[PDB]
Write an enzyme that holds these catalytic residues in place. Structure first.
Site, PDB file in Angstrom:
ATOM      1  N   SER A 201       0.882  -1.162   0.000  1.00 56.44           N
ATOM      2  CA  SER A 201       0.000   0.000   0.000  1.00 56.44           C
ATOM      3  C   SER A 201       0.935   1.232   0.000  1.00 56.44           C
ATOM      4  O   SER A 201       1.928   1.265  -0.739  1.00 56.44           O
ATOM      5  CB  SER A 201      -0.901  -0.017   1.246  1.00 56.44           C
ATOM      6  OG  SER A 201      -1.846   1.048   1.254  1.00 56.44           O
ATOM      7  N   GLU A 334      -7.926  -5.912  -5.594  1.00 51.75           N
ATOM      8  CA  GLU A 334      -7.458  -4.869  -4.685  1.00 51.75           C
ATOM      9  C   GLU A 334      -8.624  -4.159  -4.011  1.00 51.75           C
ATOM     10  O   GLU A 334      -8.582  -3.850  -2.826  1.00 51.75           O
ATOM     11  CB  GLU A 334      -6.621  -3.837  -5.439  1.00 51.75           C
ATOM     12  CG  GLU A 334      -5.290  -4.349  -5.983  1.00 51.75           C
ATOM     13  CD  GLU A 334      -4.265  -4.637  -4.897  1.00 51.75           C
ATOM     14  OE1 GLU A 334      -4.518  -4.272  -3.726  1.00 51.75           O
ATOM     15  OE2 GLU A 334      -3.203  -5.223  -5.219  1.00 51.75           O
ATOM     16  N   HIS A 447      -6.984  -6.624  -1.015  1.00 51.02           N
ATOM     17  CA  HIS A 447      -5.886  -5.753  -0.588  1.00 51.02           C
ATOM     18  C   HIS A 447      -5.181  -6.233   0.682  1.00 51.02           C
ATOM     19  O   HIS A 447      -5.815  -6.425   1.718  1.00 51.02           O
ATOM     20  CB  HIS A 447      -6.415  -4.342  -0.360  1.00 51.02           C
ATOM     21  CG  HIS A 447      -5.340  -3.304  -0.267  1.00 51.02           C
ATOM     22  ND1 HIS A 447      -4.512  -2.999  -1.328  1.00 51.02           N
ATOM     23  CD2 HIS A 447      -4.965  -2.490   0.750  1.00 51.02           C
ATOM     24  CE1 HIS A 447      -3.675  -2.041  -0.967  1.00 51.02           C
ATOM     25  NE2 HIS A 447      -3.928  -1.714   0.288  1.00 51.02           N
TER      26      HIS A 447
HETATM   27  C1  LIG Z   1      -5.734   3.192   5.841  1.00 46.88           C
HETATM   28  C2  LIG Z   1      -6.731   2.287   5.262  1.00 46.88           C
HETATM   29  C3  LIG Z   1      -8.238   2.568   5.901  1.00 46.88           C
HETATM   30  C4  LIG Z   1      -8.515   3.231   7.384  1.00 46.88           C
HETATM   31  C5  LIG Z   1     -10.082   3.463   7.985  1.00 46.88           C
HETATM   32  O1  LIG Z   1      -9.832   4.148   9.098  1.00 46.88           O
HETATM   33  N1  LIG Z   1     -11.237   2.640   8.198  1.00 46.88           N
HETATM   34  C6  LIG Z   1     -12.419   3.405   7.998  1.00 46.88           C
HETATM   35  C7  LIG Z   1     -13.252   4.478   8.799  1.00 46.88           C
HETATM   36  S1  LIG Z   1     -12.668   4.721  10.456  1.00 46.88           S
HETATM   37  O2  LIG Z   1     -13.291   5.842  10.553  1.00 46.88           O
HETATM   38  O3  LIG Z   1     -12.347   5.070  11.844  1.00 46.88           O
HETATM   39  O4  LIG Z   1     -13.827   3.766  10.951  1.00 46.88           O
HETATM   40  C8  LIG Z   1      -6.572   2.276   3.638  1.00 46.88           C
HETATM   41  C9  LIG Z   1      -7.658   1.339   3.082  1.00 46.88           C
HETATM   42  C10 LIG Z   1      -7.870   1.593   1.621  1.00 46.88           C
HETATM   43  C11 LIG Z   1      -6.815   2.739   1.373  1.00 46.88           C
HETATM   44  C12 LIG Z   1      -6.992   3.731   0.157  1.00 46.88           C
HETATM   45  C13 LIG Z   1      -7.188   3.050  -1.262  1.00 46.88           C
HETATM   46  O5  LIG Z   1      -6.663   1.742  -1.203  1.00 46.88           O
HETATM   47  C14 LIG Z   1      -6.689   3.884  -2.398  1.00 46.88           C
HETATM   48  C15 LIG Z   1      -5.270   4.111  -2.201  1.00 46.88           C
HETATM   49  C16 LIG Z   1      -4.400   4.346  -3.458  1.00 46.88           C
HETATM   50  C17 LIG Z   1      -2.908   4.315  -3.018  1.00 46.88           C
HETATM   51  O6  LIG Z   1      -1.893   4.109  -3.953  1.00 46.88           O
HETATM   52  C18 LIG Z   1      -2.793   5.551  -2.255  1.00 46.88           C
HETATM   53  C19 LIG Z   1      -3.598   5.463  -0.950  1.00 46.88           C
HETATM   54  C20 LIG Z   1      -5.099   5.248  -1.181  1.00 46.88           C
HETATM   55  C21 LIG Z   1      -5.668   6.594  -1.600  1.00 46.88           C
HETATM   56  C22 LIG Z   1      -5.841   4.854   0.166  1.00 46.88           C
HETATM   57  C23 LIG Z   1      -5.443   5.656   1.360  1.00 46.88           C
HETATM   58  C24 LIG Z   1      -5.386   4.566   2.567  1.00 46.88           C
HETATM   59  O7  LIG Z   1      -4.236   3.714   2.756  1.00 46.88           O
HETATM   60  C25 LIG Z   1      -6.641   3.574   2.703  1.00 46.88           C
HETATM   61  C26 LIG Z   1      -7.969   4.303   2.831  1.00 46.88           C
END
Ligand SMILES: C[C@@H](CCC(=O)NCCS(=O)(=O)O)[C@H]1CC[C@H]2[C@@H]3[C@H](O)C[C@H]4C[C@@H](O)CC[C@]4(C)[C@H]3C[C@H](O)[C@]12C
Ligand SMILES: C[C@@H](CCC(=O)NCCS(=O)(=O)O)[C@H]1CC[C@H]2[C@@H]3[C@H](O)C[C@H]4C[C@@H](O)CC[C@]4(C)[C@H]3C[C@H](O)[C@]12C
Ligand SMILES: C[C@@H](CCC(=O)NCCS(=O)(=O)O)[C@H]1CC[C@H]2[C@@H]3[C@H](O)C[C@H]4C[C@@H](O)CC[C@]4(C)[C@H]3C[C@H](O)[C@]12C
Ligand SMILES: C[C@@H](CCC(=O)NCCS(=O)(=O)O)[C@H]1CC[C@H]2[C@@H]3[C@H](O)C[C@H]4C[C@@H](O)CC[C@]4(C)[C@H]3C[C@H](O)[C@]12C
Ligand SMILES: C[C@@H](CCC(=O)NCCS(=O)(=O)O)[C@H]1CC[C@H]2[C@@H]3[C@H](O)C[C@H]4C[C@@H](O)CC[C@]4(C)[C@H]3C[C@H](O)[C@]12C
Ligand SMILES: C[C@@H](CCC(=O)NCCS(=O)(=O)O)[C@H]1CC[C@H]2[C@@H]3[C@H](O)C[C@H]4C[C@@H](O)CC[C@]4(C)[C@H]3C[C@H](O)[C@]12C
Ligand SMILES: CC(=O)N[C@H]1[C@H]([C@H](O)[C@H](O)CO)O[C@@](O)(C(=O)O)C[C@@H]1O
Ligand SMILES: CC(=O)N[C@H]1[C@H]([C@H](O)[C@H](O)CO)O[C@@](O)(C(=O)O)C[C@@H]1O
Ligand SMILES: CC(=O)N[C@H]1[C@H]([C@H](O)[C@H](O)CO)O[C@@](O)(C(=O)O)C[C@@H]1O
Ligand SMILES: *[C@@H]1O[C@H](CO)[C@@H](O)[C@H](O)[C@H]1NC(C)=O
Ligand SMILES: *[C@@H]1O[C@H](CO)[C@@H](O)[C@H](O)[C@H]1NC(C)=O
Ligand SMILES: *[C@H]1O[C@H](CO)[C@@H](O)[C@H](O)[C@H]1NC(C)=O
Lengths: 532, 532, 532
Positions: A201, A334, A447
């Site tokens: 990631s 993914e 993923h």
């Molecule tokens: C860190 C992860 C998710 C964290 C989340 O906190 N859960 C949800 C809500 S929470 O409120 O408290 O409940 C990951 C999961 C999927 C990821 C995203 C997607 O996979 C899309 C990617 C594309 C990448 O090359 C760049 C990061 C990114 C643009 C992302 C940013 C990040 O790492 C994310 C969003």
């Protein structure tokens, strides 16, 4: 018997011995070794500095805190990715520039085993190094595993677009840790001459970045990107960033009279305050209403003029850089479940249609960056296939999965190949038994799924079918082998074709066998649709 | 004439002339000369830094503030120890790294008189240099007297046991002042080549410390410890101090996530806040209830790895250090009244018994550090003598007086002797007429009683019997003589035997005459009782 | 055309081309080039530091903020002095160490035109560099015009009279900018070898100051003071300043235990807070009630021992300094309207009497510093002339105008002449058509009136009689000529006699012709009245 004590340039470090089932030589484990000075006070938003040397023996026996981040989000991801049986609850702090070392060597000798430095992912917003346990991989392939940490969110990526706060603090932290390894890894039986970086990631994207950075030159000798590269737009902020700076500044309760003024004001704020600002912002949570283009998802890598002299695109169009064996891989699905679920994707209906699709894709602009004039055309090539509303939902996912990782990865790999450097690709298609319960059994190669095979999850967690156990053993070998020779191949493992002109790649999974032209049709397509 | 103006490395200093009754050459007095940069803001909990040079003429004519400390406690001690007629009320501030100079030389010449630097006591918690007036001693023995100040309490001794806040700031301040003297004292008619350090209580302990510190090497040429040495356990924190750090941190309203986090948070706190924390800690008052071992009395010297490379014990077991003439003394009744009264000792009954004794001694663990398994045996050797409940109370005091100063002092003296260095001891038994009213006339040689003879109290205060006046004259001579030749002896003074194999020491008082084997029986005893 | 890009020691700067009516070669304009590091946080009340070099191309295309100051007062003065048609509204910030460059050169060549650095006035309390547009002068006389900014009010002049905060931060900023010019001006077609400083009011005073400062030596080669010199007492704080320091400290809510304590506490305060303190101080408004001597008007220049080693008076009594061509001028009616109106002068009656005069002059003590024992005598020589109460009001103004600028200026000029250095004087008597409406048509040569001719107001604003347009052309020539040869003369311009023994000066206005012994009677007079 006696706890392991190693000598480093900044002082002595005390670790602990840990034995893995069925292995004579126990692994020496050191937790929380500092590789930089705590980026507190005036050191915030500045390049990491060398650490202060200690007078006696420092006990590296407690998991270091994770950089400040959304505590819920972080703990959640730590659970869904962790390769150990019991997830370790962590603490939050700006004092997080630490790394964890795992060495299977006999410190009482002059061992020089290959080193593999892991860069955790987390969108450059959340994550931690303690989440990944190196014990298994360290023992099974006899390599020194190091898990580094770097500044996240605002703390590690805030930028004003000028010299008052260039940005990329986090990547600088990463580089810093790498120098630490060059200057110290020898004392843990590692060979500073054979360092391999690898991450997934955002961590994979970072690897891609260090491979383009002048600064990194000579800090590693092999690289691996898992589901993430530099062309992965969402993580790279191209264009004038000043606006986001001013936005963050405001939300934090700061003026914006000048850049210098903003940085100064932010340096005053307490960690707690900046954490609230990080929350107020609502990031990963994908905004649906309002203008999709105005919706700003994050603040990652930028073209600072130090770590990166120009956009990744421009950079890879040139072959005037130190090239090393690079492995670029992706997973079958993914966008299968993990990602959508974490961003709170509206696809909780288990089906979609051509009309609701274009709407969703458009609101997904901050994650795909597709003009609303192409959306219809893009939606057509992927959804116009069947009428099964369910197939469309799945096709829609593949759509995003290709734009975010699929195509970028392959493009990167090709350029690297063409730059005249050993290149290798793979596609991991398997559904680990460690998957969450809320994950449908039809989602294979989601993923981060590879994480479990790579870190030897089957040897630390419970109930792994012999099949899974074997899969893991296989992957670790390939990885470790690469780290050794810059070539995954070896006796006992299927043949892995190098990514050359035939574009051969390895399909890892229940049936691991070679293949060709990965995502070739897609790349070709999207390239034109993007040429407007 | 014209106020005295001297030139120093950092700029010109303006003083004032003060004449003492019956002395032609008036003494030049400079008050409040800075020897370091105000340890404010980010400089808190860090080594003292060189002072900023001034552009014109700095008037050293006002008493400098005393380092932050319990204002009541401080003013009280200042009154009970002051050698001047009227006690000078002082101000509190973190800006206290100043020293006061008293020179009887004729600045219009190239005088090179011996220098005596005084380190006030106060348990490293309170105290001040302005309390001691150098006028008398300066004039009577023709030596330049300097009274230094150093950081106290939290400000000067807070430690996390690691490089984020090693500690011993106070001692570092002391060393700093010493370098100032080497680099400047010449301009006040002093001879940088003949510097003598001397102090009492904690100040005496500090002298003992500098004598073991690599840093001090070459900053002095003679040393004197009055009622206090390095082996004086209570003042030296041995063992992991991290716990006390976290405790202080909490009381101050700080997190404890990491060391760096604690120090940073404490650097934020205002002086006022830290002063309240200092009060809350209830530092001097002896706790009776709860667990005696858990009761933490202070936070003094520590084995930082800079000022001190290892415990005093280990250090003096070696003879690989620059050895200088060292004078170690004690008073007849160290625990006679002053100390107990100031800690609020329960002995306000004027009598005690074998049972209440062991109980009291046990609660005194933070001040004697005696295991509860030895207490009975220790109580027996001292109290089992008579049945007079009053005698026991007095014997009980002598008990503590021997463990805190008595034995430590002699042991120190012996080691120094054995290290092959001029050593001298003394036992001051006299009751100054300046004693407080609340002090019983049967208490002779109480803690600090020597201070009045040493600083010429009889020539500044009023109503001193000719006997007292003469006593004082005698002590000053001995002291000054030592400062001169590293030998107290001289014409007109009783013979003072050097502390060699015969273990001869001088008994100072109404009848000053030599003696032998001071506290020999005791040392021998306690040594075994401690060998468990 | 492509925007102008110049290379400086700290990085590339991007400007904008601006063409003036009837001029082929357009002027390259750069706005907001930093010449020092933003004096924020711990850098407050400290000498300015070198600026951080930038990685790419810095766009100098936005007017920099003006240093923190009374916003109303500032904007008001900016309007009354601005030479451009539309007054530019500015922003406030501590981040104001910027300078604006105006070059008429063809950057595509190696031009080395003379440089003229302008120091805006504002009593060292308010002002800005963006107020003055260099376009006209730059184009008309082919010289590179630079408008610098320096810290104001508390931020740039707070002093404790000792090394903890010497003061004169503002002047140091000024010096700093000058070094920037030496090290960089070459890249804008300027000739570092021919730099000329010039300013008005406080800015003029500053010029006078730099001409006496050891630090300035070699940073300029010609100087010009317009209505303001160093002997201008009101702006120079002589005597112990410690009191004002403590006053400011208190108003700001700080303790005053020591100097170090004050500076530290003030460094903590936010800009907003210090701005409120600046307002509370009611600095420029003339207090009438209370004691006139106690009324403290400001906190300007001081004898720090770095910028200035001693009072201007003492300094000019010596000829041991690098002397350069110096032009000193004044205006017919300095106290005509602008100044009085701005301090809220009680003279809103249009008439006065001998009795109300002495009372007013006395309350004017902070602006004239006249003993109340001389007031009657002074009032007599000026007012005892006629009985016309109106004439007295006008004579009273001339009274102040002579003490504040009149005499000082001439005295300065004489000393400079006698020191054996090219000296030139002038008296500007003209009423610009750009005068405010509230300004009576009988006021000619009011404070700052020359500003319009010097900066070519007639070529940027509207409705300038041909007479005014010509006047301006003439002044610019004289000024520029001086900047070139250190001599205003040239073909086409009246002859300007050098200020030598005959004391010739130029009267500029509708009828520009030479004259002699400017304010000679006055100087002679006041000198004696001051010798008490
Ligand atoms: C860190 C992860 C998710 C964290 C989340 O906190 N859960 C949800 C809500 S929470 O409120 O408290 O409940 C990951 C999961 C999927 C990821 C995203 C997607 O996979 C899309 C990617 C594309 C990448 O090359 C760049 C990061 C990114 C643009 C992302 C940013 C990040 O790492 C994310 C969003
Ligand atoms: C986030 C969860 C929602 C919990 C909530 O309480 N709703 C439960 C039922 S319903 O929604 O309200 O109808 C999960 C539970 C089941 C999930 C859905 C189904 O499992 C079907 C999958 C198919 C995947 O490959 C794509 C996501 C998805 C199309 C889902 C979207 C989402 O993650 C859901 C809806
Ligand atoms: C500074 C003095 C008193 C401080 C006190 O706070 N006053 C009392 C109550 S107050 O509420 O506000 O009134 C002195 C008097 C007696 C001293 C103590 C004892 O004499 C015991 C000594 C032993 C030494 O070698 C080390 C210091 C020390 C362990 C002491 C620390 C300190 O200097 C004390 C306590
Ligand atoms: C701290 C003082 C107490 C003031 C209080 O009001 N009590 C007064 C009388 S009583 O106590 O309540 O019986 C003093 C006053 C007299 C002191 C006592 C007597 O003077 C007897 C001395 C003998 C010393 O050498 C040892 C302390 C001591 C055994 C005392 C302990 C203590 O310092 C006392 C009691
Ligand atoms: C900047 C101007 C006025 C500032 C003023 O604050 N306005 C007034 C009231 S306010 O909100 O409306 O309240 C000018 C006008 C007249 C000027 C003053 C006089 O002309 C006297 C001069 C003498 C010079 O050589 C030095 C500056 C100075 C001692 C002045 C300082 C300053 O530049 C003033 C006061
Ligand atoms: C500051 C202004 C006052 C506005 C106010 O509302 N008053 C208006 C009329 S009155 O005052 O109340 O009588 C202006 C307006 C007209 C000005 C007056 C007249 O124009 C006469 C001038 C003559 C000048 O050379 C000296 C100031 C002065 C002797 C004035 C002092 C002042 O600046 C005044 C009074
Ligand atoms: C501060 C703390 O309480 N944790 C432990 C640290 C951790 O390693 C780092 O805080 C993060 O790993 O290590 C120590 O041994 C050390 O550095 O001397 C002290 C302690 O045991
Ligand atoms: C109260 C106090 O001590 N501060 C004083 C300092 C002292 O020089 C230093 O503090 C050392 O005495 O400076 C003065 O004496 C002075 O130069 O006029 C005034 C000031 O009050
Ligand atoms: C936010 C803003 O508008 N400020 C401008 C600043 C100015 O240089 C300084 O504020 C001084 O003017 O930096 C730029 O010019 C630049 O370097 O590209 C861009 C920006 O437009
Ligand atoms: C020291 O000199 C300063 C400077 O004038 C003065 O303010 C101070 O009063 C002098 N010291 C004393 C109290 O004599
Ligand atoms: C710099 O200025 C040019 C011309 O005004 C403009 O095209 C460009 O967008 C600017 N870049 C920045 C840093 O905003
Ligand atoms: C760190 O842990 C070790 C256990 O291996 C222990 O011996 C040591 O005392 C600890 N550090 C300290 C001195 O607290």
């Amino acid at each position: 018997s006696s706890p392991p004590v190693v000598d480093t340039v900044h002082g002595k470090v005390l670790g602990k011995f840990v034995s893995l089932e069925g292995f004579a030589q126990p692994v020496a484990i050191f937790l929380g070794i500092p590789f930089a000075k705590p980026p507190l006070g005036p050191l915030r938003f500045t390049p990491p500095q060398p650490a202060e040397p200690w007078s006696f023996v420092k006990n590296a026996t407690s998991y270091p805190p994770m950089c400040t981040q959304d505590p819920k989000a972080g703990q959640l991801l730590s659970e869904l990715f962790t390769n150990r049986k019991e997830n370790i609850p962590l603490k939050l702090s700006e004092d997080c520039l630490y790394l964890n070392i795992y060495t299977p060597a006999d410190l009482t000798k002059k061992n020089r085993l290959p080193v593999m430095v892991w860069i955790h992912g987390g969108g450059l917003m959340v994550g931690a190094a303690s989440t990944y346990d190196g014990l298994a991989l360290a023992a099974h392939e006899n390599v020194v595993v190091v898990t580094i940490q770097y500044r996240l969110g605002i703390w590690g990526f805030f930028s004003t677009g000028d010299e008052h706060s260039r940005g990329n603090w986090g990547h600088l932290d990463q580089v810093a840790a790498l120098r630490w390894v060059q200057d110290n890894i020898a004392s843990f039986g590692g060979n500073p001459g054979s360092v391999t970086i690898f991450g997934e990631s955002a961590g994979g994207e970072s690897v891609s970045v260090l491979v383009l950075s002048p600064l990194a030159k000579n800090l590693f000798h092999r690289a691996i990107s898992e589901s993430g590269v530099a062309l992965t737009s969402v993580l790279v902020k191209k264009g004038d960033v000043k606006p986001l700076a001013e936005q963050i500044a405001i939300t934090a309760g700061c003026k914006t009279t000048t850049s210098a003024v903003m940085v100064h004001c932010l340096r005053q704020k307490t960690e707690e305050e900046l954490l609230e600002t990080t929350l107020k912002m609502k990031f990963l949570s994908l905004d649906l209403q309002g203008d999709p283009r105005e919706s700003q998802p994050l603040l990652g890598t930028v073209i600072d003029g130090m770590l990166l002299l120009k956009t990744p695109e421009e950079l890879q169009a040139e072959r005037n850089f130190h090239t090393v064996p690079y492995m670029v891989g992706i997973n079958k699905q993914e966008f299968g479940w993990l990602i959508p679920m974490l961003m709170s994707y509206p696809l909780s209906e288990g089906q979609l249609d051509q009309k609701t699709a274009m709407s969703l894709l458009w609101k997904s602009y901050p994650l795909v960056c597709i003009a609303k004039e192409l959306i219809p055309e893009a939606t057509e090539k992927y959804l116009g296939g069947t009428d099964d509303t369910v197939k469309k939902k799945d096709l829609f996912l593949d759509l995003i999965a290709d734009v975010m990782f699929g195509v970028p990865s392959v493009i990167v790999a090709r350029n690297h190949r063409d730059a005249g450097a050993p290149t290798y690709m793979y596609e991991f298609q398997y559904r680990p038994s460690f998957s969450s319960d809320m994950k449908p059994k039809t989602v294979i190669g989601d993923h981060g799924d590879e994480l479990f095979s790579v870190f030897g999850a089957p040897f630390l967690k419970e109930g792994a079918s012999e099949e899974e156990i074997r899969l893991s053993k296989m992957v670790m070998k390939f990885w470790a082998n690469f780290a050794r020779n810059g070539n995954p191949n070896g006796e006992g493992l299927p043949h892995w074709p190098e990514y050359n002109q035939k574009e051969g790649y390895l399909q890892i999974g229940a049936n691991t066998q070679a293949a060709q032209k990965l995502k070739d049709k897609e790349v070709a397509f999207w390239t034109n649709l993007f040429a407007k």
